[model samples]
Target: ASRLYTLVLVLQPQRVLLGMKKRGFGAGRWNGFGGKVQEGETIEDGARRELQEESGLTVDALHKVGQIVFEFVGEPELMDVHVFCTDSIQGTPVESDEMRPCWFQLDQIPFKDMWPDDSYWFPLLLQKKKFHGYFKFQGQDTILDYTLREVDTV
Candidate 1:
């Protein structure tokens, strides 16, 4: 089985908006805003909703930029993450109970404080390329094996 999720990154000049996951799966790591896709809503809408709920920022549009499937060593279900990005946005990022919003300079992103897989594909995102990838993780922080490549369409 595959569970659907969204991951939205707010890209701005020289920086990107990230959230510090306060608890749950990614607790203590800095990442983009997103969560599970609820029923009765489109994936894009779910992404938008998650971004708003987690960061207090509303965006007028989102570009579907990537698709990635994640698997943990002993887990039965796969995580299908739809990645979106937008340079045009409205409102400021404010902290929520689940996350603390912060901005990171493009060159200053704390990869050590983020999921290890980020180091492989984030460069493609920064170059504005669409991509597809799969990651098999040994645990929360280690990638046992992975495949990532730029694509013509996500």
Candidate 2:
């Protein structure tokens, strides 16, 4: 099975932007920038490309924050997810056909537009804590189970 790499970018919250895709996947919803890894692309490469393509930002410094496993019920396999954190970057975000960029306050994130799992780990990341997690879902409808482990902090 292939793996997916995602970048968890944090700006001043006021600087963070949200874009609604005109179509596809989470259309009309706000979320982070990311996609599947392409052929011959390293995890870092994939992360960089996704961030650039979706948000027009070039990462200045990135660190491996954690990993997650998405297992689907009635399926015999699992999806591996690599999560990365980066606070340093350059470029202004703009809305494209794939996304519509808009800024939000730290306390004003649109949770209704995000996955349930996001609320669990995102806070820790915002606090500069590293974590690993697992989320089991049933065809994206329900979260069957979840587990989170914090590290790199005492």
Candidate 3:
């Protein structure tokens, strides 16, 4: 079965907020704030929930920018990730048990420490374009194959 997940990126004109995972599935990388959707909440709400849970901040709006499906060799589960971005946020982001939040300059995004697929879709997101992608991976590091493209709507 495909598991639904959320990824929220708080952005400004010149920088973007990211978090360094402290533990669990995606530990040790710098990425956006979010996680699995809990029952009874909408996906957008789930995105809001996870962002607050991990980063100690909230936003008035979330703009959907991308969706990506991830497949791993030897694993039956697929992760369907909904991606969102917001330019306005409430509160200063503080580190939580799960992640350490930080702001990266637009030209200084830490791609090497993020998921390989991020490098492909992030540019599109920054361009204010909506996109969809599918990535087939060998374990955690190697992307065996993939396809990605911009869309008129997300």
Candidate 4:
């Protein structure tokens, strides 16, 4: 219950926008824009603001797509990650010191270059379905165990 993070992804037709993590946590991978929620910040507001700060784009709106409970092998606390989806947004994507923005075709997502847990949840997002899942990781790159399922509502 300590670190609450929020992420928002914008999908246009069949293309998905992602940012290459330049450093920290999920560095060296392609992921959505987000970070630890700050004081007095609402989840939806935090997501949109972080997306803009990291990728230089302003999200028009965000829809709750899912949530994931992430844990590391030796970590006692679980990280709560709220996921969001956006079909409408504005501004051009540009690289910041923390991320490099880019787009990918639905079939060409770099799953290998992203968090091991991402592959499990992305499909539901693209299919317009909501989902909830939990992933326990041994290290930053390895998912020791996980569970995922599609849901009627998120």
Candidate 5:
């Protein structure tokens, strides 16, 4: 229930790199790139692994940005997403086995095609604000209640 995960956002001042998950838990959704941290790997390493594995991007020195704690009512595990972002990275965005990569203009983020929680705090990231959030979901797609704050640093 305490497992750690990373969510990496490759972004620009006016655009963001997003991917349609080809399979697994949130398949069919378009969101930032990332996944669960492996044993002995740093959270950053895990994030890099997920981004590379899903989108064929190789990155290092990700900016530590925010944190979100999520609890789904019907599930036992809590999702601790250590948020990161960077406009700087290596390689062109490419499709991979797990994701179809795309760049979205900031005004056109596909919130309707993403998990409900994303839109709530996502804008904060776009503004380059460090944040901390807690979201309790009634189910996978319904947010029962939530709290968010802009922090000085993550």
Candidate 6:
């Protein structure tokens, strides 16, 4: 099985932004920012690349917050994920063929449009808390099991 890594990015929110892609893999999803890791690239490199590709912003500092690894019992491989946090950055976000960029207040995030698991740990990270999480899902609609922990508090 192959391993996959992604980087999640949070940007400054605006009142309302547009001109973003409204279809494709992440159709209608409003969330942070990320993408798959490429060959010959480090996780951090991939994070930076994904941030730029999805949001058109360059981040100066990114701190690795956590990781999750699990298997889809019915699928063919295991999934690995790396999470990061960042506030230092540059440039305005723009939409691309892969994702549409938008801004939502921290308290008014469009969680209904995001993956079910995002609401779990995203807020903790946003608050500068350290966390590690694992989720087992059946397709994208049902979560079979899940667990989350704060590293510092544990």
lDDT of each: 0.94, 0.73, 0.91, 0.88, 0.88, 0.69
Tens digit of per-residue lDDT, candidate 6, span 41-125: 9888888788787788888787787676655658876667787767677888776666777766667766677767778877776
Off by over 4 Å in 4: none
Using lDDT as the yardstick, the better of models 1 and 5 is 1
Clash tally, candidates in order: 0, 1, 0, 0, 0, 0
Q: How do all models score by TM-score?
A: 0.98, 0.85, 0.97, 0.95, 0.95, 0.83
Rank order by TM-score, top first? 1, 3, 4, 5, 2, 6
User: How well does candidate 5 match the true structure in TM-score terms?
Assistant: 0.95
lDDT per residue for candidate 4 within 11-105, as digits (tens), equals 88989999998777888999998988889989888998999899898887799999898999887878889999898988899887888989999
Index of the highest-lDDT prediction: 1
Error of 6 at 45 (Å): 0.9
- Clash pairs, candidate 4, are none
Model 3 weakest lDDT span, ten residues long:
91-100
Worst 10-residue lDDT window for candidate 5 reads 89-98
Q: lDDT score, residue 60, model 4?
A: 70
Is candidate 3 or 6 superior in lDDT?
3
User: Model 2, which residues run further than 4 Å from truth?
Assistant: 13-15, 75-77
lDDT of 2 at 64: 79
Residue-by-residue lDDT tens digits, candidate 5, 27-135 = 9999888888998999988988988888788887798888999888878989999999988788888887778999999999999998988898888888889999999
Residue 24 of model 3 has an lDDT of 88
Q: What is the lDDT of residue 142 in candidate 5?
A: 83
Query: Can you give the lDDT of residue 145 in candidate 4?
Result: 88
lDDT per residue (tens digit) for residues 56-147 in model 2: 87886767777778787888767676777676778888668777777778788887787667778878766767887889888765788999
